[PDB]
Design brief:
The complex is a heterohexamer, with two copies of chain A, two copies of chain B and two copies of chain C. By secondary structure, chain A is mostly beta strands. In chain A, 5% of the residues lie in helices and 50% in strands. Chain A is built from two helices and 18 strands. In chain A, the strands form five sheets. Chain A has a five-stranded antiparallel β-sheet, with no helix packed on it. In chain A, a hairpin with a 3-residue loop joins strand 5 and strand 6. Chain B is an all-beta fold. Chain B has two domains: 118 residues, Immunoglobulins (Immunoglobulin-like, Sandwich); 95 residues, Immunoglobulin-like (Sandwich), CATH 2.60.40. Helix content of chain B is 0%, strand content 51%. Chain B is elongated, with a radius of gyration of 21 Å. Chain C is mainly beta. In chain C, strands 2-4-5 form a three-stranded antiparallel β-sheet. Classes of the chains: A mainly beta, B mainly beta, C mainly beta. Chains in contact: A-B, A-C, A-D, B-C, C-D, C-F, D-E, D-F, E-F. Chains A and B meet through strand 5, strand 10, strand 12, helix 1 and strand 13 of A and strand 5, strand 10, strand 12, strand 13 and strand 17 of B. Chain D: It comes from Homo sapiens.
């Protein structure tokens, strides 16, 4: 088997910076390599083929190059919509028709941005079924590193809440995040103050948002 | 206008069969060829199998050889991947992609999700995330479903600005749950009607839950 | 050190020897395709007869079949079995 | 029966191989003489690189010396030691023009 | 006018040495080459050795290699064959011959007789074969000599018509003997003088015996 | 070693007849063959070279030819002076610069011719030394097959006489022959009649010639 080994694994760079992804072949592949760009939740798009030539309709900043085994995708002027995972791919029939690499998750670096924070009480329709889900929403913030902590009557919480994080935005490169505090109707009905406490690099004073049933 | 369209993915018990269909449009599927490529959740891309209908040539990857079978109905302009004796590792997203110069793939299908598991099928319960009191946020909670995926849209596709549909979370119960939230202006509430369109294909559940601010 | 006369003569007299033949040269009507490998190892009559009025030519011919990758750009590739002419016995003959 | 793909490829990739070279081709200034044998077995870079934009060329060259009968009509014959160029290692390279 | 001339052959004891000289005339012996070829009595032709003075190349036949040595004095326009350690089989007639196109020999020498034997040298006794009483015959008996050859001529070369010089016969004594006879008209006897010129080189014997009809 | 094999070994033909000598090579020699003509007691003379071309000054009747290994000297109009031994010769260095054939003794066939017979008594000078040689001479006869028998006082003789035969003549193609009866002076001095009895295909009546001391 031919092993394609991509470096780095992940990577963040600023808007306009030069990005260099290398992909190292185990044995000579010839100039039979392609580079792909997979956005989140979509199929790969072809960028480069035959190691160096640009596919029709791909912007010029994307450029493939070779050094007799070391292949190199270079994004000359990184832009917020280049946020993606990049895969190299070798063909040249040997045993299989072709082979991939493990990927290269690229990220965008931008200015520090603070979240708009919201909190949602459980629906009255949900309370009928016997559960209660409280939702703390963090919206349009950078960086991803954010800590949310729940408070039920000034009491911290333990592994009864789950976080889901938006994938980096293609326009402004911010993130968004939902924390979901799940309880029973009975347990929910025995407390008055519900609050999520947001701690972020952006805002100076850990902002808290809360409600009373 | 070239496009590939896949279908037939879903839930299957281990040792079971499952048939995938790749439907070509905008090129002579006779005078070209198709790859199947799969991508396991989180993991990268892996070759499954290949067909070149013109010369009735077909080739498979070792991990699959003997169990899967590529065919192609040139009349229908369609390629098929017949998958027998499915295992847990065969759980992946399956792409068919048409073949470019000397190798490489230029046009890929949207991709179907094949999920091998012994577990039951559950449709989601949908609960509204009602807004409170500048900018107002609201959403839908799509709780307790299996397997992936669930698709969400607001007002039948008529709203996309300020919409976030979060990735599915796997709960301790072995059931998926996600939230879909959207930001809107405060003054538009009461006038505008926000309904969220949840669709879970593998249990034929279509729910259109109306989200409104609860009396008080 | 030095190779003696009798060795050089015997090794370089008209006999069949492994020669690398371009596939295009053998099948020139097949131009749509790109062949991998582009050439193949065949036994062909080479060597010298030691006379300007004679050439080394085959008497006993045979066939050998090889798996060759045949690429057809923007269409598909496949391993096809391609037959090639070989030489089993050579003889010196007049031009 | 059939030779498999991987065998054909490996055996027909650019490498040094016993080739029969005419002595005249190598020493064209020496025309007075008739050479016996008229050709010699040398190692030369043959085989294909599997690309129209590349050619198979040598990197490591060496020399081998062979006893060759060199006839000079109406004069005399003799066994002379003639040196020939050989190839020890080949590599695929771009076509320069 | 091209000619090759050989010399130095004769009688030699086994294990002995013997040197042959081939003297070229009428061509540049520098710009050409010479073969030595020998021919044993009755038997056919056999290659001994070869020289090409211009390139100081020399080659020998296996049966001779190590024992003989070809040289050439380009100044003197002469080739030499030095023969050491001679055996009984080395007895032969030795020819040098100059080399023609791509092989072959066009001009050959008269050839010298090399005879390897332990035996003694004997000069011949010469007795006249006197005629008796149309056509009269007479001759010379050249008896008891060794080794070969003996040359006979009549009247110093002035007579060749009707002359027969018979091949040498080997007697039981190990010595050669031959007869040389000639036919002449009857009426010429008494007027004409018939002397026979015998010459045996290897014992420096020159005899000129007069043949006349014995009184009565 | 390359073996040249000549056929026939010996050969007689008439004046004017067509003579064909073949010489078979073991392995391909190319057209690198020569034919030679050795008269008795003289060196070879070159007739043909390169298998077919005629050497300068050789008469046209001599002609070489080839059949891809079988080489063939042809004397188109044999003549009495063609009496000789003919050798083929291949060159094309292959360890040995050349190998000759065995040979072809060519004879001439002519009309039957009877010998003139002579007999010679021993010299008085020879009798001094202690030996006695009687010489019976057969002159200019064909064919070679002749039987000479000695008679000392009407007594046959045994292995005390030796024959020497002339080599076939170049002009008329006849032979000549000497028989030499050797005795001691004492043994010679004890008999009166010496005679040699010639028996030949030519003469009808076995002719006898004799003398008395």
């Amino acid at each position: 088997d031919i092993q394609m080994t991509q470096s780095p694994s992940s990577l963040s760079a600023s808007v306009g910076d030069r990005v260099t992804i290398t992909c190292r072949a185990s044995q000579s592949v010839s100039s039979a390599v392609a580079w792909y760009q997979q956005k989140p939740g979509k199929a790969p798009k072809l960028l480069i083929y035959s190691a160096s030539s640009l596919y029709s309709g791909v912007p010029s900043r994307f450029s493939g190059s070779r050094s007799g085994t070391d292949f190199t995708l270079t994004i000359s002027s990184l832009q917020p919509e280049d946020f993606a995972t990049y895969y190299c791919q070798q063909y040249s029939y040997y045993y299989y028709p072709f082979t991939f690499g493990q990927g290269t998750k690229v990220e965008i670096k931008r200015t520090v941005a603070a979240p708009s924070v919201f909190i949602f009480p459980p629906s009255d329709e949900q309370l009928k079924s016997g559960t209660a889900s409280v939702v703390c929403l963090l919206n349009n913030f950078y960086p991803r590193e954010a800590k949310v902590q729940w408070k039920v009557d000034n009491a911290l919480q333990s592994g009864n809440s789950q976080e889901s994080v938006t994938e980096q935005d293609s326009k402004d490169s911010t993130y968004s995040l939902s924390s979901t505090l799940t309880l029973s109707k009975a347990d929910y009905e025995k407390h008055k103050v519900y609050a999520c406490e947001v701690t972020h690099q952006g805002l100076s004073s850990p902002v808290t948002k809360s409600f009373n049933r | 206008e070239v496009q590939l369209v896949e279908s037939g993915g879903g839930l299957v018990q281990p040792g079971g069969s499952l048939r995938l269909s790749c439907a070509a449009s905008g090129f002579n599927f006779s005078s070209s060829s198709i790859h199947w490529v799969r991508q396991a959740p989180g993991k990268g891309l892996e070759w499954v199998a290949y067909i070149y209908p013109s010369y009735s040539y077909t080739s498979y990857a070792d991990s699959v050889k003997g169990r899967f079978t590529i065919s192609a109905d040139t009349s229908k302009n369609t390629a098929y991947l017949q998958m027998n004796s499915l295992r847990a590792e065969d759980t992946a997203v399956y792409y068919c992609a048409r073949y470019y110069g000397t190798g490489a793939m230029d046009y890929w299908g949207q991709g179907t999700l094949v999920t091998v598991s012994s577990a039951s099928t559950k449709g989601p319960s949908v609960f509204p995330l009602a807004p409170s009191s500048g900018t107002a946020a609201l959403g839908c909670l799509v709780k307790d479903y299996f397997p992936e995926p669930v698709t969400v849209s607001w007002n039948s596709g008529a709203l996309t600005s300020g919409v976030h549909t979060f990735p599915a979370v796997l709960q301790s119960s072995g059931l998926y749950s996600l939230s879909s939230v959207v930001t809107v202006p405060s003054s538009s509430l009461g006038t505008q009607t926000y309904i969220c369109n949840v669709n879970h294909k593998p249990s034929n559940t279509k729910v259109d839950k109306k989200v409104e601010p609860k009396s008080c | 050190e030095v190779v003696k006369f009798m060795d050089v003569y015997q090794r370089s007299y008209c006999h069949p020897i492994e020669t690398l033949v371009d596939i295009f040269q053998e099948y020139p009507d097949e131009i749509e395709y790109i062949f991998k490998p582009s050439c193949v190892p065949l036994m062909r009559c080479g060597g010298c007869c030691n006379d300007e009025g004679l050439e080394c030519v085959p008497t006993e011919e045979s066939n050998i079949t090889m798996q060759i990758m045949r690429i057809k750009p923007h269409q598909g590739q496949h391993i096809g079995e391609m037959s090639f002419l070989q030489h089993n016995k050579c003889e010196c003959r007049p031009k």
